[PDB]
């Protein structure tokens, strides 16, 4: 009567109508919890999570009726293929409840967790925003070290047992779905099958990540050494000129970004401050201004305005001392033309650039809204983040900041402002790549069982010391779970997407600037006022997940894989200048020097000039060509 393909057309349309209705309802519940944090809202959100995940279980079960080798229409085959993924539903009704409770317990421990002043128990501080305020703004080695150690021993130790159990359950789920381990499950996002030359295997991702990281390593070495010399200028007795930077002195709670170090590391501080935060406050910008300015940036390249619904419904500021919100910058695609942004916007260049990033997410969503339900997604986990990042790449240029009146009309480009800008960008962009690779490799190793539990923290800090050049200021036994002190770890997010994104973006920025007819180095490119580049971008955005990320990338940039070439070209002037800066310093780091076990009061030495003569000779031979 009806062939499998006609049956499948019918099934997919039923699935799409119901899934759209249900997804919109569930997303409204999620919006309620994230703007209004109340138990009534948690209850509704959890109820909708049940309805939704159970719905997808049923539809995944139903989708197995239709074999993929009996399907001609490709748009049908892709949808069915997505639907035929079992997910985490494979576990028993008992173990699924246990793992869900673990995930919730860890997330609550993170968000509710507070450390109190030892001398004042009644006054406590949460991570957001109390402890972040310190890790961003403090200059006190002891206050910063208190906050860092406090967070890792008060909330991290609570998380250790839960994370052990969580790893066991996640690996059970991954092997039950015929992956080697939960890390392999995550690497499945980058998988491609059946597209002939555009295929991509899960183990291939680790090889490409590490191979690309190699070429990041020299630039990172030099940036790290310059940052070390500059952090010595501010923490005189606490940093050795040949050692990893102490973890608590890095700009946020983890050293995930070195962005807030810029005020200390600024090369040429006499020249006007390319960080327009100060300018943003002398011009009394509120959040509405920041987002309207971003909107203008997108219209300039031929993209659409934000919907009436966006301005009506978005929560663009922290909603007051009464009602608490989840202040994590997020872009919401709910279906039915409904697009929102949740960001507790502060008047800082960080939130200016974020606003551009998160509005870029909204552009990607609005572009692919016409695709079928399951294909209303990015080509992989890194694509959305790359889309966001390129917008900030244009927004952050001094050219652009000038054209929007954040830098004065009499602002001249020069060698020094160029070096200032590249250093700042590298603090945000290059500083996070070793962090991200190290964290994800640790996780991957844990899930594969290469790291036993007696050596979780031992190996975590071995790898911080080795890959990142960051050393803990306080020894950490296995009662610690330092990795879970970060949200992305204890809330079960993959993290390699930030590394892959970081390469993609420059690959993208290259291709777009060609489309914009940019003559000049890639780091002076601003795609504003170029519909030609906006068109080239939109062509890829409206695709969504309709075709695999190898092809989605190649369509825009000309390559089927991650490339580190553009990234090095972006930072080349800074690479040269940093190498010159470090010419008489040391480069690299010792894994062994530590704040707690590296100090030595040099009362008496043994040799005439100590080893300094030998050290000079050995470094000459060491870096010899």
């Amino acid at each position: 009567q009806s062939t499998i393909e006609e049956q499948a057309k019918t099934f997919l349309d039923k699935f799409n109508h119901e899934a759209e209705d249900l997804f919109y309802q569930s997303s409204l519940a999620s919006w309620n919890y994230n703007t209004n944090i109340t138990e009534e809202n948690v209850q509704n959100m959890n109820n909708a999570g049940d309805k939704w995940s159970a719905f997808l279980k049923e539809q995944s079960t139903l989708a197995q009726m239709y074999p993929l080798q009996e399907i001609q229409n490709l748009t049908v085959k892709l949808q069915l293929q997505a639907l035929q993924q079992n997910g985490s539903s494979v576990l028993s009704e008992d173990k699924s409840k246990r793992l869900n409770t673990i995930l919730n317990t860890m997330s609550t421990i993170y968000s509710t967790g507070k450390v109190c002043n030892p001398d004042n128990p009644q006054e406590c501080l949460l991570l957001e925003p109390g402890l972040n305020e310190i890790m961003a703004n403090s200059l006190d080695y002891n206050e910063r070290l208190w906050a860092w150690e406090s967070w890792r021993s008060e909330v991290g130790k609570q998380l250790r047992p839960l994370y052990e159990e969580y790893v066991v359950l996640k690996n059970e789920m991954a092997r039950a779905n015929h992956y080697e381990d939960y890390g392999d499950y995550w690497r499945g996002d980058y998988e491609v099958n059946g597209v002939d030359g555009y295929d991509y295997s899960r183990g291939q991702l680790i090889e490409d990540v590490e191979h690309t990281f190699e070429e990041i390593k020299p630039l990172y070495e030099h940036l790290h050494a310059y940052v070390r010399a500059k952090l010595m200028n501010a923490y005189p007795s606490y940093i050795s000129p040949i050692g990893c930077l102490p973890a608590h002195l890095l700009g946020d709670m983890w050293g995930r970004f070195w962005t807030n170090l810029y005020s200390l590391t600024v090369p040429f501080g006499q020249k006007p401050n390319i960080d327009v935060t100060d300018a943003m406050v002398d011009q009394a910008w509120d959040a509405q201004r920041i987002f309207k300015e971003a909107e203008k940036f997108f219209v300039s390249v031929g993209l659409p305005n934000m919907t009436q619904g966006f301005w009506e419904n978005s929560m663009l500021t922290d909603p007051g001392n009464v009602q608490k919100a989840v202040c994590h910058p997020t872009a919401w695609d709910l279906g039915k033309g409904d697009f929102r942004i949740l960001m507790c916007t502060k008047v800082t260049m960080d939130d200016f650039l974020t606003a551009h990033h998160e509005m870029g997410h909204i552009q990607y969503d609005m572009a692919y809204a016409a695709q079928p339900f399951l294909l209303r997604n990015g080509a992989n986990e890194g694509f959305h983040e790359a889309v966001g990042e390129i917008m900030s790449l244009s927004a952050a240029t001094p050219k652009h900041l000038k054209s929007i009146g954040l830098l004065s009309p009499d602002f001249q480009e020069d060698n020094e402002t160029e070096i200032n800008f590249l250093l700042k960008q590298a603090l945000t962009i290059v500083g996070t790549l070793p962090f991200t690779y190290m964290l994800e490799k640790w996780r991957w190793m844990v899930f594969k069982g290469e790291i036993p539990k007696d050596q979780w923290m031992k190996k975590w800090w071995e790898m911080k010391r080795e890959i990142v050049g960051v050393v803990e200021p306080v020894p950490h036994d296995e009662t610690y779970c330092d990795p879970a002190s970060l949200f992305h770890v204890s809330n079960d997010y993959s993290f390699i997407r930030y590394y892959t994104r970081t390469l993609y973006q420059f690959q993208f920025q290259e291709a777009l600037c060609q489309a914009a007819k940019h003559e000049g180095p890639l780091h002076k490119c601003d795609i504003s006022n170029s519909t030609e580049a906006g068109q080239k971008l939109f062509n890829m955005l409206r695709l969504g997940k309709s075709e695999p990320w190898t092809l989605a990338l190649e369509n825009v940039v000309g390559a089927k894989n991650m490339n580190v070439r553009p990234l090095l070209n972006y930072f080349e002037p800074l690479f040269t200048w940093l190498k010159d800066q470090n010419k008489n310093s040391f480069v690299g780091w010792s894994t062994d020097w530590s704040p707690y076990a590296g100090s030595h009061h040099h009362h008496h030495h043994h040799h005439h000039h100590s080893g300094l003569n030998d050290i000079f000779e050995a470094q000459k031979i060491e870096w010899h060509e």
């Binding site: 999620s30 999570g49 995940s53 993924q85 997910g87 997020t330 339900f373 209303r376 809330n491 079960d492």
Partner: peptide, 13 residues
């Protein structure tokens, strides 16, 4: 965070 994904329908806020 509800998503249009089968493998990962729900993500922790």
């Amino acid at each position: 965070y509800f998503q249009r994904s089968v493998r990962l329908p729900y993500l922790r806020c």
